[PDB]
Amino acid sequence: AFGXVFPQAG
Amino acid sequence: AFGXVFPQAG
Secondary structure: OOOOOOOOOO | OHHHOOOOOO
């Protein structure tokens, strides 16, 4: 999420 | 974000 600031699938 | 946890476009 959040421009990759939260690590996350996608 | 996160499927709707955080309101966002989409």
